[PDB]
């Protein structure tokens, strides 16, 4: 048991879907667990396909950096789709140490402990447009480490203060 | 020839090294060439390291992203280390597409087509004090993609405005 790794481009460079279509792809197959790590999420597209996931059962563990988090509850006001009411979906804040606050720079996708995308995209329109990013689609048993991070920085996430 | 990856993380977990050392040791043992992108770079330290590897006469290539370049700039002049005036570095900017800045969202750092430091460090003060990071240490031939991608970064970028 060994570690695949594929790289993915924006734009795209030599594979047929663009990293936002792999990343809907990777929820829409998504069967038991998904896992995120994201330093800002405000994609309404990314979004939906989560909240449908949790419709068919999936549970997704989603832990946001704490100084964008507002980004996020902004999107999910505006979507009229309330994250705390949603039964399967759980998120907490991550940070680092204050002084200018200090930050959870890490973000990946992690589906069923079988493939993570790991790398420079932001779920955020502005990659989608504007940005130049790359991932890693990675199988195998580096995904190991990956739960392993995910469970570590869960660990260390809080309940976001709006939830009462 | 596969590909081997360790992980490291920020702050140290069942590592010996920071990160920040271990970049800095990747510099010191450089021979020939070090390929850099990054979205911002002022660390000081880092910096000392790639001029004193250049001097011993490694080739140093950086790609910096062009809407935080004058935090380099600002930098190298602090320093009193004019990055124009040492002849074994180049330095070009790459940028996104704008509408609002489009950027370049991608970092790592190659070294002799041979190792790859690819995650989500930047080179700044606040990675080495606040923030949560996590990096891989890349070798073997997933490192062969990694030379693509800068060959192609280092095609589409720029002799930054400052440089006449
Ligand atoms: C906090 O504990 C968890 C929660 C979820 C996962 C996971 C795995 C694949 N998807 N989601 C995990 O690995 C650890
Ligand atoms: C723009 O062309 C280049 C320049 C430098 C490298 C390199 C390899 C290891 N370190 N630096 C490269 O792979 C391609």
Redesign the interface.
């Known amino acids: 048991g ?2 695949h ?1 594929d ?1 993915l ?1 924006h734009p795209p ?1 030599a594979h047929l879907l663009t990293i936002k279509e792999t990343i809907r792809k990777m929820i829409k197959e998504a069967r038991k667990v998904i896992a995120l790590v994201m330093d800002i999420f405000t994609d309404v597209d990314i979004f939906k396909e989560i909240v449908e996931a949790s419709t068919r059962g999936v549970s997704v563990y989603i832990l946001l950096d704490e100084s964008n988090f507002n980004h996020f509850l902004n999107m999910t006001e505006k979507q009229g789709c309330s994250v705390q009411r949603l039964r399967n979906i759980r998120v907490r804040t ?1 940070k ?12 990946f996708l992690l589906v069923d402990c079988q493939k993570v995308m790991y790398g ?3 779920y955020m329109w ?2 989608e ?6 991932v890693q689609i990675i199988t195998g048993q ?1 995904v190991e ?1 990956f739960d392993e ?1 995910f469970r ?2 869960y660990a260390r996430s809080c309940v976001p203060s709006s939830f009462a």
């Open positions: 060994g570690t790794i790289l481009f460079r991550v680092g140490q204050d002084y200018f606050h200090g930050k959870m720079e890490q973000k420079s995209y932001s502005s990659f447009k504007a940005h130049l990013s790359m580096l480490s991070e570590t920085l």
